[PDB]
């Protein structure tokens, strides 16, 4: 593994390096200038004035092996140099640490050999036996030079892939003070202190303090950075204090609580009664037994013979007739309950004392009573309860007459007929039904 | 404070530095190489090819003073050097700024003295009078050299504690371009700009923008990064819109709004009546005075003498009896109310007109006729009225009798009896109580 | 554009540079030391031992042009040097890359000219034709030197404003290992990696991981870093599960639901009746027709003639009097209802069968009967329903008497009188009103 470069030069070399007593490098301004350019701690490929690495690869011919190296300079360390201690011209003292050569390539090296169609490692090597002796190693993982050398890079003769790890200086310092620091990759530090500004990858500049995970402790009421809940969605797992909503429960609105669903403490048969005063109370309303109910609130008649169908009621097993009458004082008397030929022929006729009374195809001798003298109605149809008079003030008045009398169903129905010859009769009736059947059961 | 080192070498030195004319250093490749290595701005202990500081402490013997210094190199700046201007061999020109010597130690210095059992400051001193003249100062706070020197470190001969601040280069630059940067302590800048990635101490890599304090502006409704409240705990300091819940208020559920608690606008004695139409309204229900109340809705009898104990009621100060009677049309007569020897002996016997009737231990002639007839009862027990008929259709029918009659408490109680000779009655009674006491209190 | 500096020095220079063979620099320790100080990649103004730029501007005299430069050193790169290949004294080999000179100024340069009242660029130029040949260009945008130079800075003669870009080393390296790093401006990296600590501009130190935007996903229930809502404010956009509040709806509390607002399923006229055992139910309470209502529940009398104004009823059109009586068995007789001369003189006098009775200014003989007899009453005012009896048990007892009788309005009013000759009378009455007008309408 050799390519002895015809024109490469190395500096510095003297009796204390590996060169013969006469074969010391002649001094040059350019050598001193190029040597002073050393900066790193290790061995590295030197940068141009722009800050671009020199000794670059070009014209990789791939499987046909060959590759071009462009001119430039690199620094290669070597240990075990000897020096002259002070004025004593004898080379007498050993250096304790490794120290750099400069390797200067003035020309492009052209079509340097590699192994076919595989990975190869490239090394630049100085032979410390001559002023200038320089060579290159290459091969498919072939052994690096034993002589002072730098791993100029790696080339793959199949893929044309290249990397080079030694292409600029490693530099170890204590404290770096700079204006600007710009890394192509990682800036690692065991503390990163962004005074004035921190910019993240989204390009957002932060000055105020950043937020940690588990900051949720703060968002609650009376924490710093509390949130307003107005307009947020969802249901809280705990039920919440209900807002004013009485009106929502109404008859046909969204909520609907029916009264039959509601509680009461009240005893049986109790009913909510208003006390006035906005408030209800559980009292009781008690209707009577012995119930009576109306059918047709009976018609008026005046200045005329009575319009005597004062009811044509629905079937009730007993009826209670009641009358109010204004009377012809000039010709009072008969209140002829003529009641002619009702649908079934039940009648009886008896007066208030008269024990017996005459009967005919229509009533001859049954009357209600304008003049409170003796008369009555007594039968299955028609039980009476006493008489009335045709005056309040001795001559004439309206405030005269009432009676109460009743009939069973003998006919399933009835309508009651009445006459008066005097004409000047006036009247209102009432009628009410009751309900015990004509047999063993009401 | 002296240890004249036998084998240390210093470079470079001229007539223009502190040496006599004959005592200028002889040039060596090793000297130029080790001088070129300089990189810092100040005076510092040099690093090896690995980037590890040299001239290190070893074998600190503590209170027995002695310490070992390993070989290596350091750079020491000195001002006031004179140089030759151009071609003129005359040392004529003063340098304006301080410039480095290299100090090379080829040997480990062995068991260097310190003061006993205390802190000590160690300095490496160059004497600019010879090619090679070097010494070390040590002592309990003892003064640094006047001569060009570096603070090689501090050792405490009690504790064995050591630090050395000057042990790698302070470096000041304008712009640093790097691949990677790795600081042991702080990275600092007025703008840290993490393109692509920021990694925190937890090892989480961020690309998206980070969060500032007081970000609570966002989490609310209609801000970016809203939160859903579904499932969270607590009670809101404002009461909330209540969800549909009418059914919860029912008779025995968790909510129980009893009716006696509720409002009504209605006037006193008003009651909620249903109107139909799903809706309640404040009506008034008015029961009558003159209240009558039932005890025993009296038994049927048919084809038989009435099984007459039709009341065996609870005490009422007045009872009202009402009858319904179906008939033996072939043989009508009395609905007997002769009764018998009841618990107290009050009866009166008076009829329709007859004014008088006869009496015995069980009654002779108290009758309630199934024929409209001169037949009545009037007494403390038994106030009667009116008489019916034994037919509807002229032969036979059900639709027949009624009467209403009443009795007081004379005895605190009484049942009531009956007979009919012809047997073939059929009968239903009603009985109702009313309540006014026998004296000044109802 | 010239100021040929009389005392500046440049190193190094050989035949391999722009100098004649008579004019090669003499070697000096000071030159070697100052040259080795080079560190950067480009051309720059060298720092002092503190790390402050040298060759600073001073005493800027504005529109009167002149400016002072303080002594120091700067590095100036030059290409196209020639060197000796190895041992051959013939300068023969081209260097491939640019390499530095040192420029040393031992003196301040005084009152250097600029153009008046405008911006000016200052350049320091090495003339590679002599050992020490150095000159300065200045001018209002006047052309930079052709010769190796550095842009020492800019001064504006109008404003006195100054900046200088090249005032410390531009440096390009691969990997930097440092203790501490401090940029006066930006730190930039394609990954910033803070192990241990990150500090923001607010000066808060973070070890735990930071928060990204759109972290709101975590704050919800079941997420890490859940927030508790207790105490927060606003109304949720969804209505919430209502907490127990039955009692809040009550008659005079905040919520108020009046019963007339509520639903019922019940048929018309139905009323919520308590069943007992909590639950309300929609039954119906039915008042009877044939309504009777009280005025003044009548006073007691005993051991005395009746205190007879026993009621004074309001103008109901029909009254129903009811009595209860007790008396001395030594002298029973009439419950006198002869009355007095009433407001209107309506009477009728008819007894049971008697058909007639005498009339006078005050009544002769209208009676109610202690002991069952013919005594009876019938008229416009005064209808009657039979007689009681003078005993309970045979000996003196309370439980003696009742009757019912009624009257119309003949006068719009009335109160009823009474006498009993025995004195030793006792009584209670009832009264009730019923309404039908004395005409054609109730």
């Amino acid at each position: 593994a050799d390519t002895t470069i015809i024109d490469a030069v190395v500096f510095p070399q003297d009796d204390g390096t590996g060169v013969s007593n006469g074969d010391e490098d002649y001094d040059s301004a350019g050598y001193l200038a190029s040597l002073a350019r050393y900066a790193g701690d290790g061995s590295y490929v030197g940068g141009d004035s722009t800050g671009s690495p020199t000794l670059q690869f070009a014209n990789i011919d791939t499987a046909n092996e060959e590759v071009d190296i462009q001119p430039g300079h690199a620094f290669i360390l070597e240990s075990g140099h000897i020096v002259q201690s002070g004025s004593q011209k004898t080379y007498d003292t050993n250096l304790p640490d490794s120290v750099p050569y400069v390797v200067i390539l003035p020309s492009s090296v052209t079509n340097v050999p590699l192994d076919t169609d595989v990975d190869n490692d490239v090394w630049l090597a100085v032979d410390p036996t001559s002023n200038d002796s320089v060579y290159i190693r290459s091969g498919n993982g072939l052994s690096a030079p034993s002589d002072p050398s730098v791993k100029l890079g790696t080339v793959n003769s199949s893929t044309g892939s290249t990397t080079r790890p030694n292409d600029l200086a490693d530099h170890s310092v204590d404290a770096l003070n700079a204006t600007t620091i710009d890394a192509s990759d990682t800036v690692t530090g065991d503390t990163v202190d962004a005074t004035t500004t921190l910019t993240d990858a989204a390009g957002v500049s932060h000055t105020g303090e950043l937020e940690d995970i588990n900051h949720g402790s703060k968002h609650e009421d009376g924490g710093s950075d509390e949130i307003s809940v107005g307009g947020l969605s969802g249901d809280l797992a705990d039920p919440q204090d209900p807002k004013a909503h009485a009106a929502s429960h109404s008859a046909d609105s969204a909520d609907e609580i029916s009264v039959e669903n509601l509680s009461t403490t009240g005893s049986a048969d109790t009913v909510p009664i208003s006390q006035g005063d906005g408030t209800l109370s559980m009292g009781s309303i008690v209707p009577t037994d012995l119930q009576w109910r109306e059918d047709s609130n009976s018609p008026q008649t005046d200045t005329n013979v009575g319009t005597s169908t004062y009811t044509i009621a629905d079937t009730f097993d007993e009826y209670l007739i009641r009358v109010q009458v204004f009377e012809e004082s000039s010709a009072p008397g008969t209140v002829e309950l003529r009641a002619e030929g009702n649908s079934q022929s039940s009648y009886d006729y008896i007066s208030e004392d008269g024990t017996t009374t005459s009967a005919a195809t229509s009533i001859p001798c049954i009357e209600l009573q304008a003049d409170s003298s003796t008369i009555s109605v007594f039968g299955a149809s028609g039980r009476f309860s006493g008489q009335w008079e045709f005056r309040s003030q001795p001559n004439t008045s309206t405030n005269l007459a009432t009676a109460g009398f009743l009939a069973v169903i003998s006919s399933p129905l009835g309508s009651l007929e009445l006459f008066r010859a005097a004409n000047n009769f006036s009247v209102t009736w009432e009628v009410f039904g009751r309900d015990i059947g004509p047999a063993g059961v009401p | 404070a002296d240890t004249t080192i036998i084998d240390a070498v210093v470079f470079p030195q001229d007539d223009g530095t502190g040496v006599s004319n004959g005592d200028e250093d002889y040039d060596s490749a090793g000297y130029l190489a080790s001088l070129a290595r300089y990189a810092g701005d100040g005076s510092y202990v040099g690093g090896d090819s690995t980037g590890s500081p040299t001239l290190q402490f070893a074998n600190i013997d503590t209170a027995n003073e002695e310490v070992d210094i390993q070989p290596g190199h350091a750079f020491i700046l000195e001002s006031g050097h004179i140089v030759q201007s151009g071609s003129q061999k005359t040392y004529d020109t003063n340098l304006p700024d301080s410039v480095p010597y290299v100090v090379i130690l080829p040997s480990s210095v062995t068991n260097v003295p310190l003061d006993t059992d205390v802190d000590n400051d160690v300095w490496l001193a160059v004497d600019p009078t010879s090619n090679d003249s070097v010494y070390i100062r040590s002592g309990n706070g003892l003064s640094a050299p006047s001569d060009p020197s570096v603070k090689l470190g501090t050792v405490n001969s009690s504790t064995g504690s050591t630090t050395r601040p000057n042990d790698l280069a302070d470096h000041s630059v304008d712009a640093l371009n790097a691949t990677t940067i790795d600081a042991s302590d702080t990275v600092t800048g007025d703008t840290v700009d993490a393109t692509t990635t920021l990694t925190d101490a937890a090892g989480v890599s961020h690309t998206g923008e980070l969060e500032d304090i007081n970000h609570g502006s966002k989490h609310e409704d209609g801000g970016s990064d809203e939160i859903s409240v579904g499932g969270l705990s607590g009670d809101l300091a404002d009461p909330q819109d209540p969800k549909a819940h009418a059914a919860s208020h029912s008779a025995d559920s968790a909510d129980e709004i009893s009716v006696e608690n509720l409002s009504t606008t209605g006037s006193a004695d008003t009651v909620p009546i249903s109107q139909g139409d799903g809706t309640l309204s404040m009506g008034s229900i008015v029961p009558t005075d003159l209240q009558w109340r039932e005890d025993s809705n009296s038994p049927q009898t048919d084809t038989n003498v009435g099984t007459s104990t039709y009341t065996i009621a609870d005490t009422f100060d007045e009872y009202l009896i009402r009858v319904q009677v179906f008939e033996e049309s072939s043989a009508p007569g009395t609905v007997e109310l002769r009764a018998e020897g009841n618990s107290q002996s009050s009866y009166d016997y008076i009829s329709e007109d007859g004014t008088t009737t006869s009496a015995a231990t069980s009654i002779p002639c108290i009758e309630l006729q199934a024929d409209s007839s001169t037949i009545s009862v009037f007494g403390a027990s038994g106030r009667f009225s009116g008489q019916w008929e034994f037919r509807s259709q002229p032969n036979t029918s059900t639709n027949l009798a009624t009467a209403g009659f009443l009795a007081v408490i004379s005895s605190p109680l009484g049942s009531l009896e009956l007979f009919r000779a012809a047997n073939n009655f059929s009968v239903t009674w009603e009985v109702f109580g009313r309540d006014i006491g026998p004296a000044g209190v109802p | 554009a010239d100021t040929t500096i009389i005392d500046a020095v440049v190193f190094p220079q050989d035949d391999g540079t722009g100098v004649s063979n008579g004019d090669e620099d003499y070697d000096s320790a000071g030159y070697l030391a100052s040259l080795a100080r080079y560190a950067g990649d480009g051309s720059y103004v060298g720092g002092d031992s503190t790390g402050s730029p040298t060759l600073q501007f001073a005493n800027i005299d504005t529109a009167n042009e002149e400016v002072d430069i303080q002594p120091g050193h700067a590095f100036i790169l030059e290409s196209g040097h020639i060197v000796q290949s190895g041992s051959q004294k013939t300068y023969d080999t081209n260097l491939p890359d640019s390499v530095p000179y040192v420029v040393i100024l031992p003196s301040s340069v005084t009152n250097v000219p600029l153009d008046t009242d405008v911006d000016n660029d200052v350049w320091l130029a090495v003339d590679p034709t002599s050992n020490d040949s150095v000159y300065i260009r200045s001018g209002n945008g006047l052309s930079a030197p052709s010769d190796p130079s550095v842009k020492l800075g800019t001064v504006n003669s109008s404003t006195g404003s100054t900046t200088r870009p090249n005032d410390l080393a531009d440096h390009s390296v691969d990997a930097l290992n440092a203790t501490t790093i401090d940029a006066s401006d930006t730190v930039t990296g394609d990954t910033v990696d803070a192990t241990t600590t990150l500090t923001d501009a607010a000066g808060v130190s973070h070890t735990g991981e930071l928060e990204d935007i759109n972290h709101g996903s975590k704050h919800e229930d079941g997420g890490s870093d859940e927030i508790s809502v207790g105490g927060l404010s606003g109304d949720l956009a969804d209505p919430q599960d209502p907490k127990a509040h039955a009692a809040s709806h009550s008659a005079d509390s905040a919520d108020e639901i009046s019963v007339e607002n509520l639903s019922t399923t019940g048929s018309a006229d139905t009323v919520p009746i308590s069943q007992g055992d909590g639950t309300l139910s929609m039954g119906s309470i039915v008042p009877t027709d044939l309504q009777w209502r009280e005025d003044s529940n009548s006073p007691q009398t005993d051991t005395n003639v009746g205190t007879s104004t026993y009621t004074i009823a309001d103008t109901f059109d029909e009254y129903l009097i009811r009595v209860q009586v007790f008396e001395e068995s030594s002298a029973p007789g009439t419950v006198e209802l002869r009355a007095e001369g009433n407001s209107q003189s309506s009477y009728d006098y008819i007894s049971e069968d008697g058909t007639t009775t005498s009339a006078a200014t005050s009544i002769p003989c209208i009676e109610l009967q202690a002991d069952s007899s013919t005594i009876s009453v019938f008229g416009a005012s005064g209808r009657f329903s039979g007689q009681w009896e003078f005993r309970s048990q045979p000996n003196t007892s309370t439980n003696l008497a009742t009757a019912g009788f009624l009257a119309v309005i003949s006068s719009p009013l009335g109160s009823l009188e009474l006498f009993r000759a025995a004195n030793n009378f006792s009584v209670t009455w009832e009264v009730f009103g019923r309404d039908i007008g004395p005409a054609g309408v109730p």
């Binding site: 003297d14 009796d15 010391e24 490098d25 001094d27 | 200028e24 002889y26 040039d27 | -």
Partner: peptide, 16 residues
């Protein structure tokens, strides 16, 4: 040679 006792570039570094 020694420093100072040669003009640069006109001598090799060290010694015979």
């Amino acid at each position: 040679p020694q420093l100072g006792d040669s003009k640069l570039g006109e001598s090799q570094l060290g010694s015979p």
